[PDB]
Design a protein around this nucleic acid. Structure first.
Ligand SMILES: [Zn+2]
Lengths: 97, 95, 78, 64, 103, 97, 80, 105, 91
DNA sequence: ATCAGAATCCCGGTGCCGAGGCCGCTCAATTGGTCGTAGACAGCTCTAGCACCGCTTAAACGCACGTACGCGCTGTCCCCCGCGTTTTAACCGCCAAGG
């Protein structure tokens, strides 16, 4: 039969607050990073441990920025995220002018 | 073979002191080594600023004390100052 | 390219963040901000390796570039 | 498909002979020299006619 | 060793060496590295003591880094210290806004 | 008379205070508050005036930034009335707990 | 004593207007006072500690400059 | 040219900077080209930002640069604003930020 | 205890030569210059200790200016620095 | 409430692997001895921080009073959750014909 919405998401929130393993798996992330660096320089063989470092820092970064964005939306008398929420949080932190 | 550094055995002994029945992972030992690195670096940078805002180039323990209670928050800092001061007394009282 | 980021990946990012309900334009906005983040990071990382006169970016240089953006990360010898 | 070829060239820096590997990516016209010893790397553009002696020649001129 | 002569556990002279090669001053006093080493010693004692309690919680014997991140994120002054600090295999607080819990 | 149902007063004074240069909090009560906070960790401390002026400068700048992000939080709240938990969310995102 | 209550509502108004804030709620002022107070607590603690090692019973502008650079809220203008 | 400043054709004292490096506890030794290089970078930064200072002060028919001019010229730049993000100027204030929801329509 | 005042006057006369200045404007400028000098120099010292090089040449200064300032400013600054290196090296 | 049944927790189990013991080195801590000036300290001098008050006045406080955004409610309409259905990134085993 059909389950009622919202439940499975929070259950897997309780599941995904447990294992600190990396969410984005390796190969596509590696291709994206390689396709990026190339724009800055050529022939740059990446240490794989450095790639794991980039992956870790990126994922924790985005998770924390999501936390602030989520609390913005909770303040915004809503439950669902919006892109304007990300703009608000970034405008508070000061990445963009 | 170039000889590399770690602080693993020292804090390893300290861990064995405070918890004899406790194991540890290797990566976490590296994390603690990086931890000591970071705290040491912030302290030393505050020491260099202590020098240049005091126009002096000698480093004594007094500067280390004022550096620690500049960086660390109060209660933790005062306990650490107590530990360091009692160690200063126990060492310099003897040779 | 940038479209190697899957939808359930950013969903899992919401989950470890603990976020419940998801809109639409979130995905492309996420990819954009992630891109600019990695742009600054890997730019000054390759700047470090440029000074290194060597063809491989060190993990050390990655760590120090994170320090240069005030994003100090332990764990990997820093 | 990429070509991974070992050569009998001497690295211009570490001087180990028979330790330079050439990776020629013709799909993107990018050739890559690698040292199996000191680990240095050098990139240069390649055409369709190029061979390990073509980029190793470009590496000699890039130093001097 | 001066550390034993200070009755402590961190090597003095290594730190005295690193103070020299850090361009940290022009001259280096006698007992300043002893004081700094003791500071380090009490800091890591407090941190890993809370980590030991964190392992007592999960009933784990070997320390995983998740224990470390949790014990950082629980205590107040430590978390205000390491605010700009993240750790690989870190994770975050198991935290749920109850306004998003269902009714 | 010319009572004026509102709108020009607030925004006009915003125009004036953004044409402005100098401070807003006047000197003496701020100084006495500073000395009361100062009388808590080491007694009996003396001061030069430029330190106090810097303190007043950075204080007003700190609060101006709080007000700016609070204002954008309110605009995202589809309101013009501010709220306290706006400021609490702003300081939550700023990491200054 | 009570100079925390020396903070006036029209000053908070003026700060909101240069801050660009239009509409002011009433439950704001003492919260503002508390945040301002904690700010200045950490500031003057660090400045006085810098002067503690200075061995001079008077704190300078330079001291407060250096201390606020330590917080990373770094302000120019008065040299340091 | 006796002086190295005239030997560089610049406006800053180089041996000043070299002594600053020596009385810095920065490195142990300092070469000959680095202080010249850094002083030239400084001189470029001064001239570059003073350009925006000159235009921003000329915006108000005033011969003298005020701090408000400097803050305006910084915030009207992009690279300098992301440069000076954690930075505050004395007697600065901020930009005119009048939101569109506020004007009487 | 020297400030950089006439240096500022000569830069100003080289750019907008009909322009005055207040005292505290000069003060903020010298605050600025000292901050920038300290940030670059400390970053160069990080270059040394992260690279085990017992001194610092101009190449370290170039890469540090890359590490601090973003693109357009960085490239124009590298250009001006190398031009100064050139004219000082020629004589 | 209330039962059926998904979802998760939690208990032996075994396996395998790296944490930790361990052990033989050698290079920096040590130990001891020798110049030296940086600074701990004594002391001189004049500035400036402090306290106080009288006079001026503009700035705050209280209230009178309307009023209009904030908010609780409502209906509504729509578009993400989710579960199902393919389906293709990612990753190991065979025909080309040219050499
Ligand atoms: Zn080689």
């Amino acid at each position: 039969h059909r389950y009622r919405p919202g439940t499975v998401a929070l259950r897997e929130i309780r599941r995904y607050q447990k294992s600190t393993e990396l969410l984005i798996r390796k190969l596509p992330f590696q291709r994206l990073v390689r396709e990026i660096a190339q724009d800055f320089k050529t022939d740059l063989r990446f240490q794989s441990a450095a790639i794991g470092a980039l992956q870790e820092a990126s994922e924790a970064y985005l998770v924390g920025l999501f936390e602030d964005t989520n609390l913005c939306a909770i303040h915004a008398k809503r439950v669902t995220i919006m892109p304007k929420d990300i703009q608000l949080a970034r405008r508070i932190r000061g990445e963009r002018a | 073979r170039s000889r590399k550094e770690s602080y693993s055995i020292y804090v390893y002994k300290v861990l064995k002191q405070v918890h004899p029945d406790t194991g540890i992972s290797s990566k976490a030992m590296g994390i603690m080594n990086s931890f000591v690195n970071d705290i040491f670096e912030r302290i030393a940078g505050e020491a260099s600023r202590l020098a240049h805002y005091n126009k002096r180039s000698t480093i004594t323990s007094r500067e280390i004390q004022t550096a620690v209670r500049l960086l660390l928050p109060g209660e933790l800092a005062k306990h650490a100052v107590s530990e360091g001061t009692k160690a200063v007394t126990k060492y310099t009282s003897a040779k | 390219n940038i479209q190697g980021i899957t939808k359930p990946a950013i969903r899992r990012l919401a989950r470890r963040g603990g976020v419940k309900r998801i809109s639409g334009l979130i995905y492309e906005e996420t990819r954009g901000v992630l891109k600019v983040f990695l742009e600054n990071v890997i730019r000054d990382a390759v700047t470090y390796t440029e000074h290194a006169k060597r063809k491989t970016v060190t993990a050390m240089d990655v760590v120090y570039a994170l320090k240069r953006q005030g994003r100090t990360l332990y764990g990997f010898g820093g | 498909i990429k070509q991974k070829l070992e050569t009998q060239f001497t690295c211009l820096f570490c001087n180990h002979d028979n330790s330079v590997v050439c990776t020629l990516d013709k799909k993107n016209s990018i050739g890559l020299l690698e040292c199996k010893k000191c680990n240095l790397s050098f990139q240069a553009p390649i055409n369709s006619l190029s061979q390990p002696i073509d980029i190793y020649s470009d590496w000699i001129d890039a130093c001097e | 060793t001066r550390s034993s002569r200070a009755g402590l556990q961190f090597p003095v002279g290594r730190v005295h060496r690193l103070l020299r090669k850090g361009n940290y001053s022009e001259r280096v006093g006698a007992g300043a590295p002893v004081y700094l080493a003791a500071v380090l010693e009490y800091l890591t004692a407090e941190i890993l003591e809370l980590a030991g309690n964190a392992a007592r919680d999960n009933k784990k014997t070997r320390i995983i880094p998740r224990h470390l991140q949790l014990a950082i994120r629980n205590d107040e002054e430590l978390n205000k210290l390491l605010g700009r600090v993240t750790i690989a295999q870190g994770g975050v607080l198991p935290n749920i806004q109850a306004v998003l819990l269902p009714k």
